[PDB]
Design a protein around this ligand. Structure first.
Ligand SMILES: *[C@@H]1O[C@H](CO)[C@@H](O)[C@H](O)[C@H]1NC(C)=O
Ligand SMILES: *[C@@H]1O[C@H](CO)[C@@H](O)[C@H](O)[C@H]1NC(C)=O
Ligand SMILES: *[C@@H]1O[C@H](CO)[C@@H](O)[C@H](O)[C@H]1NC(C)=O
Ligand SMILES: *[C@@H]1O[C@H](CO)[C@@H](O)[C@H](O)[C@H]1NC(C)=O
Lengths: 118, 124
């Protein structure tokens, strides 16, 4: 229990209804750290997280994690629903976690721009 | 898809090293609502959450709630029991049992944690 997800990547373009792979990177940490899961969201590219605290957009997946390489890469399956309108979006990964002796829990967010094609 | 965990209960006393049954209630929700999982923590009885934002204390369990491989099936409205086990080395005494339920809600996809606590005595 001493590694955390530190970043997320994904293809620049995806086809709706067709699964693709998102990559999650991890690194070692001194404090105890638990990655519980990752919610996958598809958001408008203009999303304002200050006005919409915690927002990830439309939920398109959830990955339970609680396997994961402590200091490397893991691939995760993600699908944009077939009915999604084409265009530019933000793909948002919301990683739930616990850290430390006090058990601080929360979400870390990672995003990338993706083009959703028919 | 339209229900949410709104409360938690547990026994007044639990034996360390032994699993006990905690209860999670759920209610109907107007907007779309996902419960992803519940982290179970043992926190000092004096925990100030204003100073320790989002703290659950020592992690003693995690219940995955999403998908068909979910640990338990939450009824849209009602209660479900969850097996939670206090570590065998836990110091005896009074604690807060804290349940941290991760969620997503609404068309904007607001994600976060809801916290429910109850006082529990841990005995040898
Ligand atoms: C993830 O980590 C690997 C090295 O472990 C690196 O090659 C890759 O570029 C990283 N991706 C991101 C988005 O940081
Ligand atoms: C997307 O991530 C960047 C950092 O990688 C951050 O500055 C930006 O606020 C994020 N956007 C949203 C909508 O979360
Ligand atoms: C909801 O939980 C409370 C205790 O937290 C309990 O009194 C009640 O019976 C529960 N709901 C149902 C349907 O029993
Ligand atoms: C315990 O739950 C009550 C709700 O009845 C809440 O007011 C209180 O802040 C909780 N305690 C902590 C330490 O969060």
């Amino acid at each position: 229990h001493h590694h955390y997800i530190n970043s997320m990547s994904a293809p620049a373009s995806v086809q709706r209804g067709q699964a693709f792979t998102a990559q999650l990177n991890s690194s070692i940490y001194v404090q105890n750290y638990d990655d519980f899961g990752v919610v996958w969201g598809l958001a408008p590219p203009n999303l304002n997280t200050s006005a919409c605290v915690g927002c990830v957009g439309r939920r398109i997946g959830y990955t339970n994690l609680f396997q994961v390489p402590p200091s490397g890469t893991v691939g995760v399956q993600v699908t944009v629903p077939a009915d999604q309108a084409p265009g530019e979006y933000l793909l948002i990964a919301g990683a739930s976690y616990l850290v430390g002796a006090s058990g601080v829990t929360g979400f870390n967010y990672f995003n990338t721009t993706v083009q959703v094609c028919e």
